[PDB]
């Protein structure tokens, strides 16, 4: 059972195999460290964590030394202090004098630990070394003279990203970390080497020289670039977004964020909508006033009612705006409310959340024994979900099988065909993987929502539900899973939006509200002549060029809002900056439009809007909660009513390359760093 150790004479009970560093963490002491990271493997080479045992003559490395029974750990001992001073003396003896010209200046673990557990003087009278800088892509700037050879980037690269391209070339004092050849370290998780590097050897190239840590203000929010719902911290200085950093959440993030999340913040400063715009007598877009634009839209809304009113919700819309638009369109008896992504409406459809949620939580992947991925590329659709899958693979020997096109995941997997015919065959039991699933104690079936965009999505959903039913026929564990790639999709489905745009296609509307709809699913060729289009958004990409009235709105960094991720967890984004120019919050715009049109919505403040959200769906106001009910039996019973035949077309994921990963949405398209990344991955260097 638990063993008893002593830290500075204080008794503490720890599990067997616990290290001295973790025992000190238990008692509240933080041992200094340079090479140790709790989410990486143990290295034990920096030697900064040397602590003294009470009667042992030689100090031990706390990061790699399991505790023995009855050991007394002297963290503040004379030997420990001298060892720390010696190690810091070596590190600073070979380190270069680059602190003022270094982006790591005020947030450097070398400086802080030198000032805490180091000497204040130097007796190094020799000359320092200099190392030629490497080039590993447009995202990471390398000044390798500042590297302390802690091998965090190598261990992170290998274990987390599955990319074995970093390593140490050389021997002795001339040992260098690099790729040897001029290969660029490009991945969907490549800024985390910038995060984990304790020194300024690896630094963010877009953020280079812009600011200092003490100036910036930190706003804790969530990431809106996919359905993972990663927690982020936005660093802003003087009302300008300076950078994005990961925020720890051991159920979603686990301290990492994707490169699109980290480096697309500069797309919020380009191609922005700042003032309301209307068509003039020449057919061109000209700036106008909020009163004029809202009066025009209100006149059109009063003129047209019924099924002649459609709303298309994009990928970066929040629950408050969605519910406000839903109420506004319901006030005119209209119901052409839709989201720009397709989900099968047959059977239960959106009536049960378990039918379209990721029922096995992101943290629940680490418990699964077998996972079957259907019609998805999790590496680019949800990089953090793929990282969790790889971690489960590496640690618990998880068996991963992928049905469809052989994408390059960061781990070895069992490939199953390319067509849904094999997917249907597994349900019957002819495939050996049926036996594998039946013998697996913890199976998961993750169907990518990108495979539901084709015309046979309902049949795909029915087949995977049949597979899950066969698995269940053979407690508290959930097998069926759906992985989304759109942040607003889950919130829209919870609020009651109709998936897809097929309803709008079948009943062409006269008034169309494009709320952030930049997917180009519906155009004026599909719409009737003289259709009135109101595009409400923050970036002008497609909807703004095709619109009649353009309403500027706020981004996620600029509004306080609610987003539901792919697993059903609701999280609130906080305000970091204010909308530029005359741009306003989306739900406030909708409320003002309703008031001008004479259909005043019964909420004037964010609290009242969230009360309406609670009335519609309490899970939208229950924050950071993922517990729910599993109505899989009812969902399957309703699904097995109608039968559709799977098409013979292969399951080709929309994203097959990292360039396709880089260019996905409006903010990424407006970014210049993303354009640099695409050019680097296509042309080379």
Partner 1 sequence: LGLREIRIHLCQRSPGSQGVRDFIEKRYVELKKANPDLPILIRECSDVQPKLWARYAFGQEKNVSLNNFSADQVTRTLENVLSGK
Partner 2 sequence: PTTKPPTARKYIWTNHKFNVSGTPQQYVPYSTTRKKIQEWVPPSTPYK
Partner 3 sequence: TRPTIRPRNDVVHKQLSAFGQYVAEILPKYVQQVQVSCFNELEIFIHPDGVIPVLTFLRDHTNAQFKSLADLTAVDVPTRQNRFEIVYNLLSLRFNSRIRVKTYTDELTPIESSVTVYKAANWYEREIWDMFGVFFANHPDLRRILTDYGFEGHPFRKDFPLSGYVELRYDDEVKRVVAEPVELAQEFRKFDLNSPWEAFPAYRQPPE
663, 252 contact by CB (below 8 A):
no
Nearest approach, Cβ of residue 15 and ligand FES (Å): 20
Interface with partner 1 includes 333 (CB under 8 A)? yes
Min dist. Cβ of residue 417 to partner 2 (A): 45
139, 160, 197, 273: which one binds partner 2 (CB under 8 A) = 273
What's the sign of the alpha-carbon dihedral 11, 15, 21, 24?
negative
Stretch that binds partner 1, among 331-339, 429-437, 450-458, 548-556 (CB under 8 A): 331-339
- Which of residues 7 and 678 has its CB atom nearest to partner 3 in the complex? 7
- The strand pairing partners of 50, in sequence order, are 61
The answer to whether 49 is annotated as binding is: yes
Site string for partner 2, 227-266 (x = CB under 8 A): -------------x--------------------------
Is 199 one of the annotated binding-site residues? yes
Closest to Mg ion by CB, 89 vs 195, is: 195
Sign of CA dihedral 34, 36, 38, 41: positive
DSSP string, 354-407: GGTSBSS-GGGGGG-SEEEEES--HHHH-HHHHHHHHHHHHHH--EEEEESS--
269 binds partner 2 (CB under 8 A): yes
| Of 20, 153, 197, 517, the one binding Mg ion by CB under 5 A | 197
Indicate which single residue of 63, 67, 374, 551 sits in contact with ligand FES (rule: CB under 6 A).
63
Residue 353 contact partner, candidates ligand SF4, partner 1, partner 3, none, CB within 5 to 8 A by sort of partner: partner 1
Query: Is 88 among the residues that bind ligand SF4 (CB under 6 A)?
Result: no
Closest approach of Cβ 353 to partner 3, in Å?
37
HEC-encoded secondary structure of 22-71: HHHHHHCCCCCCCCCCCCCCCCCCCCCCEEEECCCCCCEECCCCECCCCC
- CA torsion angle for 566, 568, 572, 578 (degrees, to 10)? 40
Q: Which helix (H) or strand (E) holds 10?
A: strand 10-14
Q: How many CB atoms lie within 10 A of CB 267?
A: 23
CB of 446 to ligand FES, least distance (A): 37
Neighbours of 684 (CB within 10 A): 8
Residue 540 is a binding residue for partner 2 (CB under 8 A) = yes
Angle at 157 between CA 154 and CA 160, to 5 degrees: 130
| Contacting positions for partner 3 (CB under 8 A) | 26-30, 32, 75-76, 112-113, 115-116, 213-218, 238
User: From the list 128, 218, 270, 438, which residue makes contact with partner 2 (rule: CB under 8 A)?
Assistant: 270
Q: Is 212 in the site for partner 2 (CB under 8 A)?
A: no
What contacts 24+ positions apart, CB below 8 Å, involve 420-423?
420/375, 420/456, 420/459, 420/460, 420/463, 420/646, 420/647, 420/651, 421/646, 421/648, 423/374, 423/460, 423/463, 423/464, 423/467, 423/646
Instruction: Based on the shown chain and the rule CB under 6 A, indicate whether residue 87 belongs to the binding site for ligand FES.
Output: no
Q: Should residue 156 be labelled a site residue for ligand FES when binding is judged by CB under 6 A?
A: no
User: With respect to ligand FES, which residue has the nearer C-beta, 65 or 357?
Assistant: 65
Q: What does the binding site for partner 1 look like in residue numbers (CB under 8 A)?
A: 327, 330-333, 335, 348, 350-353, 494, 496, 615-619, 622, 628-629, 631, 634, 637-638, 641
Residue numbers at the binding site for Mg ion (CB under 5 A)? 197
């Amino acid at each position: 059972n638990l063993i008893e150790v002593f830290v500075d004479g204080q008794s503490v009970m720890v599990e067997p195999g616990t290290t001295v560093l973790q025992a000190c963490e238990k008692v509240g002491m933080q041992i200094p460290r340079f090479c140790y990271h709790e989410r990486l493997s143990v290295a034990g080479n920096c030697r900064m964590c040397l602590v003294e045992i009470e009667k042992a003559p030689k100090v031990v490395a706390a990061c790699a030394m399991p505790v023995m029974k009855g050991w007394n750990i002297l963290t503040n001992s004379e030997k420990s202090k001298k060892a720390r001073e010696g190690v810091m003396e070596f590190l600073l003896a070979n380190h270069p004098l680059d602190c003022p010209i270094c982006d790591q200046g005020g947030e450097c673990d070398l400086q802080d630990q030198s000032m805490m557990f180091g000497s204040d003087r130097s007796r190094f009278l020799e000359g320092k070394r200099a190392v030629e800088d490497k080039n590993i892509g447009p995202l990471v700037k390398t000044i390798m003279t500042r590297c302390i050879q802690c091998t965090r980037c190598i261990r992170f690269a290998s274990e987390i990203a599955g990319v074995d391209d970093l390593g140490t070339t050389g021997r002795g004092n001339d040992m260098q970390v690099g790729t040897y050849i001029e290969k660029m370290f490009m991945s969907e998780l490549s800024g985390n080497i910038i995060d984990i590097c304790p020194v300024g050897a690896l630094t963010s190239k877009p953020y280079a020289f812009t600011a200092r840590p003490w100036e910036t203000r930190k706003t804790e929010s969530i990431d809106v670039m996919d359905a993972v719902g990663s927690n982020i911290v936005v660093s802003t200085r003087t009302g300008e977004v300076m950078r994005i950093l990961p925020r720890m959440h051991e159920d979603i993030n686990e301290e990492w964020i994707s490169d699109k999340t980290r480096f697309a913040y500069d797309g919020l400063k380009r191609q922005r909508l700042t003032q309301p715009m209307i068509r003039n007598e020449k057919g061109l877009l000209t700036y106008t006033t909020w009163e004029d634009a809202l009066s025009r839209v209100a006149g059109m809304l009063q003129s047209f009612q019924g099924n002649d009113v459609a709303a298309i919700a994009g990928g970066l819309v929040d629950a408050e705006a969605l519910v406000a638009l839903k109420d506004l369109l319901n006030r005119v008896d209209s119901d052409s409310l839709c989201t720009e992504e397709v989900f099968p409406t047959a059977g239960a459809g959106t009536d049960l959340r378990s039918n379209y949620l990721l029922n096995t939580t992101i943290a629940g992947v680490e418990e699964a024994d077998v996972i079957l991925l259907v019609g998805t590329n999790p590496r680019f659709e949800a990089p953090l979900f793929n990282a969790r899958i790889r971690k489960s693979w590496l640690h618990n020997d998880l068996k991963v099988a992928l049905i469809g096109s052989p994408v390059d995941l960061t781990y070895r997997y069992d490939h199953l065909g390319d067509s849904p015919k094999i997917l249907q065959d597994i349900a019957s039991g002819n495939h050996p993987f049926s036996q594998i699933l039946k013998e697996a104690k913890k199976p998961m079936v993750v169907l990518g929502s990108s495979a539901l965009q084709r015309s046979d999505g309902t049949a795909i959903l029915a087949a995977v539900s049949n597979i899950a039913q066969n698995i269940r026929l053979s407690g508290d564990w959930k097998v069926m899973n759906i992985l989304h790639r759109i942040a607003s999709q889950v919130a829209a489905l919870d609020l009651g939006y109709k998936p897809g745009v097929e309803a709008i296609r079948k009943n062409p509307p006269k008034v169309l509200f494009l709320l952030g709809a930049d997917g180009g699913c519906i155009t004026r060729q599909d719409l009737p002549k003289d259709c009135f289009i109101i595009y409400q958004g923050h970036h002008g990409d497609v909807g703004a060029p095709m619109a009649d009235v353009i309403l500027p709105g706020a981004a996620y960094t600029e509004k306080s809002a609610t987003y539901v991720n792919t697993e059903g967890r609701a999280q609130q984004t906080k305000v970091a900056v204010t909308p530029p120019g005359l741009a306003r919050e989306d739900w406030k715009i909708i409320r003002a439009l309703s008031e001008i049109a004479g259909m005043t919505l019964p909420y004037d403040t964010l609290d009242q809007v969230r009360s309406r959200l609670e009335e519609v769906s309490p899970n939208l106001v229950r924050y950071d909660d993922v517990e729910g009910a599993n109505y899989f039996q009812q969902a399957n019973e309703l699904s097995k009513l109608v039968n559709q035949q799977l098409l013979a077309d292969p399951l080709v994921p929309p994203q097959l390359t990292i360039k396709d990963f880089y260019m996905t949405d409006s903010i990424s398209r407006a970014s210049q760093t993303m354009a640099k990344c695409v050019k680097a991955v296509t042309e080379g260097i």
